[PDB]
Symmetry: D2
């Protein structure tokens, strides 16, 4: 067996960085992206791609089925995310809250349901979600992101307790300001380390969590933020 | 000044207990419930009541409008609320969970804040769960969306602090609004369930001037159940 | 039942405010302070005072013995604190770290040891420590305070678990900027509520925690800080 | 010669998780310097092609000797890993004032003391990592390990202040918080309390230390990472 990694929202940013690093580590990769970039990248990394939505159970099933048809196993699932509603806290509509849940919570839950049967058969698996350093120290800048990634942390803990005995782990990586988007001086200066994080630094964190050496870590939320957040 | 409290899901359990205690404290009370029990309780307490859904903006607006027509202010809002394997919960179930345990607080908050802004004074207290940050399989949608509620609460608190409008959550452990099991009771270091009245007392404190410098907090009332500092 | 409260470091600041409020609530009061202020306050409130140190075994035992001789019970212990070492984080010497521990940790622990026997006989008791809102979001401004109050929280949890079955509770109140000291504009403006807290607000939180209504609360750390800290 | 030979100091590195960390860092390519109160420290350092001092992780003098010998030999300190011995255990009110002070030396100043001594080299380097082996019980404390939990919660707050103070100089500090690890004898009761139904390996703690000592983890600072098989309850 070559080990296998599926990456949802893997066509750009932190998803793409994670897919590249996991391929470099030696995983066969399967990528889902609503852009064409996902399939180009999977091609370049020698793996497979599906072009579809991380909100669609059917695109997801196609991705999972193709990965199992080809390699017969799924060792790692990495879930990255899009961008959800941003507005003043009482102005976000009920509809927008629902859309935020789709973007930032069910984007991780939906594919988790579909990969777990393989991981149960294997008695081995890792699921890593890209969350946000603001989950427990939320800001008005990113209200639906923080709300639903806090909820994702609770989901992650219930999941971790439910599947621990089957050697299946789930952890979240909580990035601060990352150079996947343009920097501002105010934001950069607000980080004690006085720089944005590299998308490759997030990918390195994913790589660790996907390795045998991290096997005893489950249910955790690891902030990778140059010291930005205040809580121990 | 006769101060005013609105209680959503105040027909039974911790909502009813909160409504009774706030009435005893001297607040005028307006109560929403879907069963009808909220109206019967309001009448007993000398207040007003609406029977409707805490997921419906129209029934909520009716409660708010009637309260402001009667007493001209809203000092306090208390939001109270109504098991499956973690991967078996459907997308539809998660969305329903969010309506039930997250938007139940958010929807009435939007409608009371204007009065609170005019008053330069207001308190919103949400009844959450001690399982929010230490969740278990027993209360999955509740815990997930109450963790989300905490993050909402902090953004809200930051947004409205300068206008003297505060939001806090009370996080109950095992409370006597339901029957005990011995395993549950024994898991609590205090070796007893909490009283609905003890939750209501914590609500009362958070509705008082003495608590005015508390905002954005999640206060566990659980007999020592949860493990975290 | 005439209930009884002991307050350590109760001569001024949040300690004195707590003693005044608990007297107003109807408690008999006993006060320890290194200042003459403690005794003047106790005498006013019809209670008893010892002039002495919350680091001295002899002074504390005297306090406790005189309280039990007078009223036969101890229902509430409130521990306020003085001021400990403040310096750049690596310049604080081993000796200063040990002094900080005495000032901010052992100040609470020492009296707790001495009042628990009465509380056990009573099958009822409450201990409330005045801590700091910076305990888990520490600031270089108050390094020994934050370090030892974070320590205090873990002590408080072990205590709460050990004595819960005997109906003896311990909780900590974590103030932000309080008007026991003069404001600075920068500090005041950093608080979302745009004001310092009142000592009377801290005392009201102490009052609630000493009440029957709070009887199901134990092991907790309650921030009273106008929204200053960032963590949920 | 064409690539920097990075250097790691391990305190209490003679056995258990400290020795595991030493071994792994050496395997990663670090030159290792080990302090241990037993001869185990030096023997292990010999095996790993490094240096060792026999002495106490509570003694400024012995720590200064290791640091000096390290800088004398390799000219730099890139990584400091602080493990710990064992402190007082007793019912919570039975721990004497003296036992609390001893606990502080064992679980808090064991990290602080060497941190003070390695930071100047790290500042000259504009690069450094300090990793303390703490405990999963720090914020979910148990009556089993009272001084450990108290002072490791304290260590977290120290760590955050340190991290804010030195972040601009690219010097980071993080804590690894192990649960039940196979460095000590196992019991069934403890094993079955862990959701993963096994103890952690010392090698899994060392793997976490290795990651945190690597360039990949450079944007992580001030954190407490629990490695506990899901034992602790908090998100």
């Amino acid at each position: 067996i070559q080990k296998v990694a599926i990456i949802t929202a893997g066509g750009s940013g932190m998803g793409a960085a994670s897919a590249r690093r996991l391929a470099q580590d030696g995983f066969a990769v399967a990528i889902l992206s609503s852009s064409g970039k996902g399939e180009a990248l999977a091609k370049e990394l020698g793996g497979i791609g599906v072009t579809g939505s991380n909100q669609s159970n059917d695109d997801l099933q196609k991705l999972v089925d193709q990965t199992l048809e080809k390699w017969g196993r799924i060792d790692v699932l990495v879930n990255s995310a899009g961008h959800g509603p941003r507005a003043p806290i009482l102005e976000i509509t009920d509809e927008d809250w629902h859309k935020g849940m789709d973007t930032y919570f069910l984007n991780a839950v939906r594919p988790a349901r579909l990969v777990v049967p393989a991981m149960q058969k294997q008695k081995s698996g890792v699921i890593i979600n890209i969350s946000t350093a603001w989950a427990f120290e939320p800001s008005a800048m990113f209200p639906t992101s923080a709300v639903f990634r806090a909820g994702l942390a609770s989901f992650t803990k219930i999941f971790a307790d439910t599947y621990a005995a089957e050697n299946i782990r789930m952890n979240n990586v909580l990035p601060g300001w990352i150079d996947s988007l343009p920097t501002t001086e105010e934001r950069r200066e607000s980080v004690p380390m006085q720089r944005y994080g590299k998308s490759e630094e997030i990918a390195a964190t994913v790589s660790f969590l996907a390795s045998d050496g991290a096997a005893y870590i489950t249910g955790q939320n690891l902030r990778v933020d140059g010291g930005l957040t205040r809580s121990v």
